[PDB]
């Protein structure tokens, strides 16, 4: 062991020291994976957990979400204008064609710096107000347009302001840019969560799911209103059955978030819930339909006594979502402790 | 068109059968078997705090990189067990790592759908991310450097890709796999490569052309592992159906099947010896198996891991085998 081998060994020892420090930091992290379906609420649950922290207007969280809302507003013009080419709809004023390139010319500059320039604001105002695009927006059924485009387009002036402060209603409707994996660190009441959202994962679960073998719990977001909104709740039931009864998540408790409960309250008044579930045979009011939907999700749960489902009707107004996750994770930790101590 | 495709499949199957004179067992039935490989753990590389998903040996046969779910990419001196570097990843969900043949770079990727290239030899003393290879819409299951500027990555989006690391662009996209592509093996001359996918197919690709030269389908389940034979005329696959297979590029066949009845776990990683006589396959049953690549019998077992052997690789000099596993340890065997 020469002098340089000694200094290489000392370097390896410092590396081990940092590795242990990092592992001790990460061991205190509680890893949860958000695992709801396509339009379920995972993104809005993570966003709502960030925002409503300590007051409904924790604005410092709202500051990081300005680029996303800008991108949604910016893409909204790009989506509506590009819809004209597929719909073969001509602009009422041909001068929009020059402005049509103008948005794409500034599209790169706006998304990269996370701001809406005044020139784009005029370009956006003119393009959106053009009747030809207005018909194009009305024909959104055949075009890939996010439902948040309508509200932002009606308030592009608020979005482009220099001191624009995103609002909770503005953020909660934004669509997080599709990213393979999404990690969110939450510290709630001395407990640090890492909500690991696997975003657009264009691959099979059976290959990447064991990467989350040792998560504390799974947060499964379900859209309650989606029972009649291509078999959205049937997709949630299939996904939940697969995830709950996964070989990797035998002892991993599931936090079941049932999202958009008020929207369900309107939809059942209009649409009967028997459409999704032909064998419902129950009342079509809320606090009956909701409990029914929980019952299906928690009845898909096989292999009880090892894992538990913590069902919650998510309230975007209050911190009952993060509080429920804290309570469920606390119960998960305490139950695990009871288990190896042998009491339960 | 579907009838024509099935007719062409039948034609390829008959053409393959026309070239199957004698099985590889019958031809190799007379060679003296290797006795029993007593590889022993010469080094245990400790320092990873989560499951190890990938390792790659350096071409100097002394350094190896490993990727773990603990978010670290560690470079080891396997002779001294010294940790040369510990690279913290932006995404801890890393499934693959590659070590550049120059040694100037490592790659890693996984659930972030990005191959990150790391500059090992920077003027500052740190390893930094030199390139983020975005463009895959699924996770990266494997990555392999062609040289300092080129790297082939397989993905769960069912496509392999050739990248220009300088520009960061997919120089070639290798489409044709229907299931998740789980592995790559560059040919020794790196003019072509094989990829195994979850559609139980192994596809021989042309790097320069960009086209699928051959498709190899003998497995019953997902192919997790693939490895070229040292002469580049054959490759071995390791699948979830608890079997390995040796395919020949020129015969376009499945020469040999490396299976045991009491082996029911899938294969996570396969590799060959320097002479290629040994196919060392890592298994879910916690222990790697040494196979006689020519006679299809287990020469030995590299038991010694407390969890699934997730990755393995034989040095370029053939001296040692490193097995990483989900028990967070790398063990050098010999």
């Amino acid at each position, epitope marked *: *062991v*020469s*002098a*340089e*081998d*000694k*200094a*290489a060994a*000392e*370097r*390896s*020892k*410092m590396i081990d020291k940092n590795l242990r420090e990092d592992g001790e930091k990460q061991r205190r992290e509680i890893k949860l994976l958000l695992l709801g379906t396509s339009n379920s609420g995972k993104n809005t649950i993570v966003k709502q957990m960030k925002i409503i922290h300590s007051g409904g207007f924790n604005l410092e969280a709202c500051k990081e979400y300005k680029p996303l809302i800008i991108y949604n507003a910016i893409d909204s013009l790009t989506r509506i204008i590009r819809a004209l080419a597929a719909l073969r709809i001509d602009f009422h004023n041909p001068d929009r064609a020059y402005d049509a390139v103008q948005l794409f010319a500034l599209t790169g500059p706006a998304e990269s710096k996370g701001e809406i320039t005044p020139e784009l604001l005029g370009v956006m105002r003119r393009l959106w107000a053009d009747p030809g695009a207005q018909a194009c927006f009305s024909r959104s059924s055949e075009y890939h347009l996010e439902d948040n485009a309508a509200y932002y387009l009606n308030d592009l002036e608020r979005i482009a302001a220099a001191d624009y402060i995103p609002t909770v209603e503005d953020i909660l409707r934004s669509r997080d840019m599709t990213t393979g994996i999404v990690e969110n660190k939450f510290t709630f009441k001395e407990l640090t969560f890492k909500m690991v959202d696997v975003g657009a994962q264009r691959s099979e679960r059976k290959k990447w799911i064991h990467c989350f073998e040792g998560v504390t719990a799974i947060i499964f977001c379900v859209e309650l209103s989606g029972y009649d909104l291509t078999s959205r709740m049937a997709a949630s039931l299939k996904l939940f059955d697969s995830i709950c009864n996964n070989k990797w998540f035998i002892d991993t408790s599931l936090i079941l978030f049932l999202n958009k409960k008020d929207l369900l309250a309107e939809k059942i008044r209009r649409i009967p819930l028997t459409i999704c579930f032909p064998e419902y045979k129950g009342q079509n009011t809320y606090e009956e339909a909701a409990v029914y939907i929980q019952r299906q999700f928690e009845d898909l749960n096989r292999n009880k006594e090892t894992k538990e489902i913590y069902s919650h009707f998510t309230c975007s107004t209050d911190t009952s979502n993060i509080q429920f996750v804290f309570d469920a994770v606390t119960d998960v930790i305490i139950q695990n402790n009871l288990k190896y101590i042998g009491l339960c | 068109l579907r009838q024509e495709a099935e007719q062409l499949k039948n034609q390829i199957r008959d053409a393959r059968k026309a070239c199957a004179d004698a099985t590889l067992s019958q031809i190799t039935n007379n060679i003296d078997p290797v006795g029993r490989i007593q590889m022993r753990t010469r080094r245990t590389l400790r320092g990873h705090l989560a499951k190890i998903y990938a390792m790659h040996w350096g071409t*100097d046969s*002394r*350094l190896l990189v490993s990727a773990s779910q603990d978010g670290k990419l560690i470079i080891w*001196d396997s002779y*001294t067990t*010294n940790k*040369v*570097h510990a690279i913290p990843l932006r995404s801890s969900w890393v499934m693959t790592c590659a070590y550049a043949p120059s*040694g100037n770079y490592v790659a890693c990727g996984g659930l972030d759908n990005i191959c990150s290239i790391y500059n090992l*030899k920077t*003027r*500052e*003393g*740190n390893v930094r991310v030199s390139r983020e290879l975005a463009g895959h819409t699924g996770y990266l299951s494997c990555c392999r450097f062609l040289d300092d500027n080129q790297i082939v990555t397989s993905s769960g989006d069912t496509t392999c890709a050739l990248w220009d690391i300088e520009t960061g662009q997919q120089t070639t996209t290798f489409t044709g796999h229907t299931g998740d592509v789980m592995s790559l093996s560059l040919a020794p001359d790196t003019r072509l490569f094989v990829s195994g996918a979850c559609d139980a197919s192994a596809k021989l690709w042309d790097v320069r052309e960009g086209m699928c030269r051959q498709t190899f389908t003998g497995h019953e389940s997902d192919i997790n592992a693939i490895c070229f034979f040292p002469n580049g005329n054959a490759f071995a696959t390791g699948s979830d159906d608890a079997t390995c297979r040796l395919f020949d590029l020129r015969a376009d066949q499945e020469l040999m099947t490396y299976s045991h009845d009491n082996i029911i776990c899938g294969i996570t990683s396969v590799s060959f010896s320097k002479s290629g006589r040994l196919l060392l396959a890592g298994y879910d049953d916690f222990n790697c198996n040494v196979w006689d690549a020519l006679k299809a019998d287990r020469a030995g077992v590299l038991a010694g891991h407390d969890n699934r052997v997730s990755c393995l690789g034989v040095t370029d000099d053939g001296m040692a085998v490193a097995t990483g596993s989900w028990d967070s340890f790398l063990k050098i065997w010999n």
Partner: single-chain antibody
Amino acid sequence: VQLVESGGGLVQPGGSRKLSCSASGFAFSSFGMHWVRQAPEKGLEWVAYISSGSGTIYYADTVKGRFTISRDDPKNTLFLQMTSLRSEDTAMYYCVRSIYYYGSSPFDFWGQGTTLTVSSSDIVMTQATSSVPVTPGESVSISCRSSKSLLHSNGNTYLYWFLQRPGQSPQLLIYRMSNLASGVPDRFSGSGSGTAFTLTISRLEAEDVGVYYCMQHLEYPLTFGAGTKLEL
């Protein structure tokens, strides 16, 4: 990447001063740092070595106890406190970046140095040849001899070659025997075995003029050779 020494100046003998080097543009916390001095007309003489993490410190036996070497990782500053400053402590003190892992390039970057002027078992690396006369475009070979085998049993030969170009800090050329440092033109080449070493410059240019230094890194008294100058 730079190292900038501070301190120096006229010091009354028996006094005390503290040298500082501010590191910039590199991960200073991960580099073992050396102090290497050069008497105002003599060769290089290694002073001290604080490793990365400060866990290991060495001194030249000529200055042990009188100097202490310290680093400020948050400040990226390397220090040398100097006490009982004799007359033989006059030198130009170079801080040397130095990182040790497999295949690393120790002694690869050197600071500008600060001249310090004071009022009035070690491996002997011998390069007895000095002031080799040579002309541009002509191959030259500088010898170096070692009082011990620099060949370690691990396969390394811890011989270093530096280039003190006139008015310039040493430039690492060959880090371990026959290893060309990055940025060194691929005409320099190191050779040797055991104790005898040769630095062959394939086709030298006007930049190669200067003084070429041996250095063993087999042990920690780090000893140089009396540099063999090249002169046009």
